[PDB]
Design a protein around this motif. Structure first.
Motif, PDB file in Angstrom:
ATOM      1  N   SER A  81       0.812  -1.210   0.000  1.00 27.07           N
ATOM      2  CA  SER A  81       0.000   0.000   0.000  1.00 27.07           C
ATOM      3  C   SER A  81       0.839   1.252   0.000  1.00 27.07           C
ATOM      4  O   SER A  81       0.534   2.194  -0.738  1.00 27.07           O
ATOM      5  N   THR A  82       1.904   1.243   0.811  1.00 25.69           N
ATOM      6  CA  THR A  82       2.823   2.373   0.932  1.00 25.69           C
ATOM      7  C   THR A  82       3.609   2.597  -0.387  1.00 25.69           C
ATOM      8  O   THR A  82       3.704   3.735  -0.853  1.00 25.69           O
ATOM      9  N   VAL A  83       4.152   1.515  -0.962  1.00 22.96           N
ATOM     10  CA  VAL A  83       4.834   1.532  -2.256  1.00 22.96           C
ATOM     11  C   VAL A  83       3.926   2.069  -3.360  1.00 22.96           C
ATOM     12  O   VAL A  83       4.321   2.945  -4.128  1.00 22.96           O
ATOM     13  N   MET A  84       2.716   1.540  -3.438  1.00 28.64           N
ATOM     14  CA  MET A  84       1.725   2.000  -4.403  1.00 28.64           C
ATOM     15  C   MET A  84       1.482   3.509  -4.330  1.00 28.64           C
ATOM     16  O   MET A  84       1.486   4.181  -5.348  1.00 28.64           O
ATOM     17  N   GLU A  85       1.296   4.033  -3.122  1.00 28.81           N
ATOM     18  CA  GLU A  85       1.068   5.468  -2.932  1.00 28.81           C
ATOM     19  C   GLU A  85       2.288   6.284  -3.354  1.00 28.81           C
ATOM     20  O   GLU A  85       2.157   7.333  -3.984  1.00 28.81           O
ATOM     21  N   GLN A  86       3.477   5.794  -3.008  1.00 26.36           N
ATOM     22  CA  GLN A  86       4.725   6.441  -3.422  1.00 26.36           C
ATOM     23  C   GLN A  86       4.915   6.501  -4.935  1.00 26.36           C
ATOM     24  O   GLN A  86       5.345   7.521  -5.456  1.00 26.36           O
ATOM     25  N   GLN A  87       4.616   5.409  -5.638  1.00 23.07           N
ATOM     26  CA  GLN A  87       4.718   5.390  -7.095  1.00 23.07           C
ATOM     27  C   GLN A  87       3.783   6.432  -7.691  1.00 23.07           C
ATOM     28  O   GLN A  87       4.220   7.272  -8.479  1.00 23.07           O
ATOM     29  N   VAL A  88       2.507   6.367  -7.306  1.00 21.28           N
ATOM     30  CA  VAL A  88       1.489   7.312  -7.786  1.00 21.28           C
ATOM     31  C   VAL A  88       1.928   8.758  -7.556  1.00 21.28           C
ATOM     32  O   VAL A  88       2.014   9.543  -8.509  1.00 21.28           O
TER      33      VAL A  88
END
Lengths: 92, 82
Positions: free
Chosen positions: A71-78
């Motif tokens: 979830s954290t990685v996903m938000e960072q990519q976005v």
């Protein structure tokens, strides 16, 4: 590709590049035992969104950790932030 | 509305376990018994205020607080012996 950053004594961490076979809690402990052969490690901590140290002692706890991390990685990519590995801190 | 993350606190240690919605009181209590080795009272914590969750209604209300919150991402539950 998942990278697990395993904290070691004296300003280091060892990065373990995990490839995709189920990652098991036991496998993480096995790798920590290789990296820290003079230590007894039966658990590890990670930091949650509150900065709290969360102890992991089982596969179900490890799964909640991984879901949080992804979830954290996903938000960072976005949002275009630097993606960091999942840092853990081995534990007696 | 993805899984409910419960951050259990017990004897200087914190543990996060995810529960599939709809979350049942009986299932939370059973998880506490298997993880911590004994039944324990569920105290939902927010800073200096807390409340004993005694039943399904109590838990549902706590989850409602979580779901309405723009901030919170887990339910912080302090475990104490009955």
């Amino acid at each position: 590709v998942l990278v697990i950053r395993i904290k070691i004594p004296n300003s280091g961490a060892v990065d373990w590049t995990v490839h995709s076979p189920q990652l098991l809690f036991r496998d993480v402990l096995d790798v920590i035992g290789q990296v820290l052969p003079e230590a007894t490690t039966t658990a590890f901590e990670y930091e949650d969104e509150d900065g709290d140290r969360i102890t992991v002692r089982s596969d179900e706890e490890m799964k909640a950790m991984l879901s949080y991390y992804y979830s954290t990685v996903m938000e960072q990519q976005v949002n275009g932030q630097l993606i960091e590995p999942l840092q853990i801190f081995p534990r007696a | 509305q993805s899984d409910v993350r419960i951050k259990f606190e017990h004897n200087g240690e914190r543990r996060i376990i995810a529960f599939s919605r709809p979350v049942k009181y009986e299932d939370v209590e059973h998880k506490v018994t298997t993880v911590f080795g004994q039944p324990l009272d569920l105290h939902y914590m927010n800073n200096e205020l807390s409340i004993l969750l005694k039943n399904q209604d109590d838990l549902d209300k706590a989850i409602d607080i979580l779901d309405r919150s723009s901030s919170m991402k887990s339910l912080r539950i302090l475990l104490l012996s009955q």
